[PDB]
Design a protein around this motif. Sequence first.
Motif, short mmCIF file in Angstrom:
data_model
loop_
_atom_site.label_atom_id
_atom_site.label_comp_id
_atom_site.label_asym_id
_atom_site.label_seq_id
_atom_site.Cartn_x
_atom_site.Cartn_y
_atom_site.Cartn_z
N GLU A 1 2.58 -3.67 40.08
CA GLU A 1 2.91 -3.89 38.66
C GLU A 1 4.26 -3.28 38.26
O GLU A 1 4.73 -2.37 38.97
N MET A 2 4.85 -3.79 37.16
CA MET A 2 6.05 -3.22 36.53
C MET A 2 5.74 -2.94 35.07
O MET A 2 5.15 -3.74 34.33
N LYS A 3 6.23 -1.82 34.55
CA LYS A 3 6.16 -1.43 33.13
C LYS A 3 7.46 -1.58 32.31
O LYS A 3 8.58 -1.26 32.81
N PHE A 4 7.33 -2.13 31.04
CA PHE A 4 8.50 -2.49 30.23
C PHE A 4 8.32 -1.98 28.80
O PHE A 4 7.22 -1.63 28.35
N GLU A 5 9.44 -1.82 28.12
CA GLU A 5 9.54 -1.50 26.74
C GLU A 5 10.17 -2.75 26.14
O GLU A 5 10.71 -3.54 26.86
N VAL A 6 10.12 -2.85 24.82
CA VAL A 6 10.62 -4.02 24.03
C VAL A 6 11.98 -3.75 23.37
O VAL A 6 12.14 -2.89 22.43
N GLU A 7 12.98 -4.51 23.85
CA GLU A 7 14.34 -4.49 23.41
C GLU A 7 14.49 -5.17 22.05
O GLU A 7 15.34 -4.81 21.20
N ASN A 8 13.67 -6.20 21.84
CA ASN A 8 13.72 -6.93 20.61
C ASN A 8 12.33 -7.52 20.36
O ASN A 8 11.74 -8.12 21.27
N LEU A 9 11.80 -7.34 19.15
CA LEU A 9 10.55 -7.97 18.75
C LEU A 9 10.95 -8.99 17.67
O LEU A 9 11.54 -8.66 16.65
N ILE A 10 10.67 -10.26 17.89
CA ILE A 10 11.08 -11.37 16.98
C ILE A 10 9.82 -12.07 16.49
O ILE A 10 9.06 -12.65 17.26
N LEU A 11 9.57 -11.98 15.18
CA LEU A 11 8.37 -12.49 14.56
C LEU A 11 8.83 -13.73 13.79
O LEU A 11 9.96 -13.83 13.27
N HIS A 12 7.96 -14.76 13.75
CA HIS A 12 8.40 -15.97 13.05
C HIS A 12 8.44 -15.71 11.53
O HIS A 12 7.50 -15.28 10.88
N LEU B 1 8.38 -13.57 19.95
CA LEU B 1 9.15 -13.24 21.19
C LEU B 1 9.40 -11.74 21.31
O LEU B 1 9.74 -11.05 20.36
N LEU B 2 9.13 -11.19 22.51
CA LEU B 2 9.47 -9.81 22.88
C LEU B 2 10.47 -9.81 24.05
O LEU B 2 10.13 -10.20 25.19
N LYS B 3 11.74 -9.46 23.75
CA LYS B 3 12.74 -9.27 24.79
C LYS B 3 12.43 -7.95 25.49
O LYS B 3 12.46 -6.89 24.87
N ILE B 4 12.09 -8.01 26.77
CA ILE B 4 11.64 -6.86 27.60
C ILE B 4 12.77 -6.24 28.43
O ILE B 4 13.77 -6.94 28.74
N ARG B 5 12.61 -4.94 28.78
CA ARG B 5 13.58 -4.12 29.50
C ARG B 5 12.95 -2.87 30.14
O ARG B 5 12.22 -2.11 29.52
N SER B 6 13.15 -2.68 31.46
CA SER B 6 12.66 -1.50 32.16
C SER B 6 13.47 -0.30 31.65
O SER B 6 14.48 -0.47 30.98
N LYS B 7 13.07 0.93 32.04
CA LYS B 7 13.81 2.16 31.67
C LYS B 7 15.24 2.23 32.21
O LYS B 7 16.15 2.94 31.70
N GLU B 8 15.49 1.48 33.28
CA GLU B 8 16.80 1.33 33.87
C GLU B 8 17.60 0.19 33.26
O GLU B 8 18.72 -0.13 33.68
N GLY B 9 16.99 -0.55 32.32
CA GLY B 9 17.70 -1.60 31.61
C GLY B 9 17.56 -3.01 32.16
O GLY B 9 18.25 -3.92 31.72
N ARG B 10 16.62 -3.22 33.06
CA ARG B 10 16.46 -4.51 33.70
C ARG B 10 15.31 -5.35 33.15
O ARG B 10 14.35 -4.84 32.56
N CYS B 11 15.42 -6.67 33.35
CA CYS B 11 14.35 -7.60 33.03
C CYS B 11 13.44 -7.68 34.26
O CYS B 11 13.63 -6.95 35.24
#
Length: 245
Positions: free
Chosen positions: A73-84, A100-110
């Motif tokens: 598995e990989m764990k992510f935080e949300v860079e952008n949360l976009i609600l309609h 839409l949730l734009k995701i990003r690891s702690k190192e900044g990757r998708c």
Amino acid sequence: IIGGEFTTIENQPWFAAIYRRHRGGSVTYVCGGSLMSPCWVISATHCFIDYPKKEDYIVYLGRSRLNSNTQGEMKFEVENLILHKDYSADTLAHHNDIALLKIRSKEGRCAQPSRTIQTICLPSMYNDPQFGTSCEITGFGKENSTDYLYPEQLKMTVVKLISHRECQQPHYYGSEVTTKMLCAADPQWKTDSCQGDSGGPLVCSLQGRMTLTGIVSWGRGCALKDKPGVYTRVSHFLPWIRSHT
Ligand SMILES: COc1ccc2ccc(C(=N)N)cc2c1-c1cnn(S(C)(=O)=O)c1
């Protein structure tokens, strides 16, 4: 998922498990989701509208159990949360229930595609499967309406698509279900999505390809007679999805 079968993420590799950190350090499961592209997960706005702070959310890919760190598995935080911008919730019916949730690891990757982590294709305009088509759902939601706990292991089941005019009959949902929504259920009313499955995938094999046809949104009860699961119809939202990603 009421009934169905236990499964593992290698059968469901686009499934996103979304959780929320609370003040004080406890974390609980929130909603499922689907990987659309390495940096983008789509879900339902109802899962986030009351706590719209991107920083509260944890997103896993490649996870098979609610309280276990699955190999790979990989764990992510949300860079952008976009609600309609036009979302609303009536008594039963939820409107423009997509996010839409734009995701990003702690190192900044998708995300990095692997055997247990993969994208699902979006639909094409005016192209949905016909009513009666079998489609699958996945989630960590309740196994029974009277449960308060969710299953530890990921579950899945299969349901059939129902027409707009059938779902609009008086003993179904009448004029509360609209052309922007899709209904699906078990003919024998023994299996369905339930609380905890929201935001997750309704995937239909269409002209040969597995497609994200729907997003778990709302229903009356779970696995109840003449009350289908209702899903956000993704193909209507292709212009919105495009411009916001
Ligand atoms: C907050 O609850 C939710 C939330 C979302 C749902 C999405 C789909 C369905 C469905 N039937 N396919 C049910 C849902 C229920 C839901 C409907 N009633 N039940 S229950 C556990 O009996 O209260 C929960």
